[PDB]
């Protein structure tokens, strides 16, 4: 289903500060 947007949608917010 869907659910294969929200493991990336929550790596925006670590991977944002690992950048």
Do not use: E, P, V
């Not at 659910?3 to 950048?19: D, G, P, R, V």
């Amino acid at each position: 289903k869907w659910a294969s947007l929200w493991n990336w949608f929550n790596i925006t917010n670590w991977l944002w500060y690992i950048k």
